[PDB]
Write a protein that holds these residues in place. Sequence first.
Motif: not given
Lengths: 159, 32, 286, 282
Positions: A123, A126-127, A129-131, A133, A138-139
């Motif tokens: 959750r 991989l969240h 992952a969204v928000s 910066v 991120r990668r």
Amino acid sequence: SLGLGLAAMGTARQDVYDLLKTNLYQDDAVTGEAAGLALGLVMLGSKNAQAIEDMVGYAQETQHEKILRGLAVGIALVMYGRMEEADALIESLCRDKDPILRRSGMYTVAMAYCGSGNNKAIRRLLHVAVSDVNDDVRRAAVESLGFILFRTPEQCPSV
Amino acid sequence: DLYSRYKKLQQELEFLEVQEEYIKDEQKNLKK
Amino acid sequence: AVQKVVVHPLVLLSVVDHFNRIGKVGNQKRVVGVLLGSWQKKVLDVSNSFAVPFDEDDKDDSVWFLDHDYLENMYGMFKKVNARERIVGWYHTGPKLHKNDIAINELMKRYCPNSVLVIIDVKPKDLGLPTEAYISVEEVHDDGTPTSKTFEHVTSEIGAEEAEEVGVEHLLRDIKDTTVGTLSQRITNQVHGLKGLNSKLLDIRSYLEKVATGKLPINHQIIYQLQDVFNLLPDVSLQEFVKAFYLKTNDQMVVVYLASLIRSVVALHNLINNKIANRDAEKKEG
Amino acid sequence: AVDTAEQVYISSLALLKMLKHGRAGVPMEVMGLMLGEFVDDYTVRVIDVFAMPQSVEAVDPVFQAKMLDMLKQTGRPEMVVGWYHSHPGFGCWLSGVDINTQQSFEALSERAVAVVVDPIQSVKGKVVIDAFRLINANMMVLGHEPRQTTSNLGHLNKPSIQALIHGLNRHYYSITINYRKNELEQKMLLNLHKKSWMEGLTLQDYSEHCKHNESVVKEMLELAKNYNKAVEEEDKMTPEQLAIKNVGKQDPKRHLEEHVDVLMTSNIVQCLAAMLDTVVFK
Ligand SMILES: [Zn+2]
């Protein structure tokens, strides 16, 4: 120095860990690779809480980047496949503002959850992952899924 | 199969829901 | 009077860097530098600032040093490099201003008509607006004070400029922000507002219990003035005030009602729009 | 001795001092010194920035020594690491003389860094910052960087056309730049657009508020007038000829959502604050 711990990676050599510590506390960039990797590598699965405190306690005041990177991997490797006690460190690393230590914590949750098909860490991992910066964390964020999906490997190409 | 049907549908529930929250995340971020 | 000032974001960082400069002492080394501003209007503008050597002991706070030489040379450089800029006041990194702080203003009131102080907070634990500034006056009192001299709170704000908004706001990308977030910034506003209310009340009650009993001066300073604060306290629920609310609240409710009314229909258009294209493209696809 | 994947550490004051100086001297190349610290053979760090007078040839270095002196005695002593100037509306490329100061400077210090700035091409969202590093021509055939990592090669960006038309690899090599942020400045920089409780507790006005709603509803009526004719109209014309005859003065279905949104966000908060002011107070 870099392969020193990878050779003695399962033996958990406290003796090499000792001189690797003072190797890590030189306050330099040339020794950062010298100690930063093998230090945790010779303590793989050791869960040496003093080792975690050394690594995270030293990767807060430095000035170089390699001394941040070797610690970023060593701290992610010191805890190995727990999934139940590494959570405090995963949150401590993901809540950070360090563009490398978050990504260091992002790698961590992968190793603390080696193939963990737990839909809990999916959750917020991989969240962020969204928000997230920073491109680095991120990668490193999206690159923990396969490291947490051997229980059901057919799901990675669907998400 | 029949008990594994009932377990695998369960596994198909939450893993499907995390995507539901996920698209929410993606959309809100895309607005920014 | 000056009545307000507009401080730019460069300063409040050009102070933090210097507090970082002598920040190795750790225990205490109050950072004092020069404030630079504009003779804009009654309102005053603040653009630039710089530092100056300053030390002070622990006991008998009358031993402090501002290098007038360093001030003269460095401001000579800043005038040579900018005559548009000029001295306006001064600052110190004290979280709470000290009793010594009046002697500094009183010293450098000879450079500026009034060298206004600037208190900044490196660690504003309060999530409100930090870095407030004062300007001293005389308020000789009925008591018989030969010169009742004390600073004055003056409202201030954060300056802005096309370029600096560019560079700063490009730096704000490191964190997420919802400044265009509709009907969210308001909610945050009342939240932080009520937070400030509760903080102020807890502070004033801390002072009030202390003065009430045991050990605190019982001066006529505020004790009745804050009573007059109690004087206002509008008795909300009364006879005709009800007609104040129900004669307007439903008015705005009517507008909101109409807005929802059209919003529903507008949302309803796309149902026909896509239910046409789906099946019409399907039946032609097969 | 060999190059690496170098990193340009910054100081947050340095950026603002750049853009304000260049913007103030926008119609010409403004020059200044970049002051910092040589952290290692790998990365650099700038912490202080300042400029001098120029009517591009700098005048008396008596400002130089006294400047650095008084910067040492107040604060501390530091090291000059590089420099900067403007290419206003330019291709942010080292000019002919700009490179001509570079053999001067690198001969003084090894990792002397040029810093290009343009306060023109920088939009409030993103700034066009730049900096370069001179390269020899004697080693034009021999390798210049070992390339022992992806960061300064296949991990950064892509050289732009208007500066590649000048050097792009030649007479110099580009360099990466990041931003180090102290937590102290970070926290206060986080909060500089909030207000006190007064703002969050204002009740704007119901005379100009109701006057305002009375305004927007009025023309919104006309927007519905147009919307009726437009929606029912529907020439069978294909979904793109409508998109070519709608440029013009046509705008139903667009203002309609807008006025509804504004009328919403006004009335909502306007009621809410009045609610709180009575629940909380007395
Ligand atoms: Zn140029």
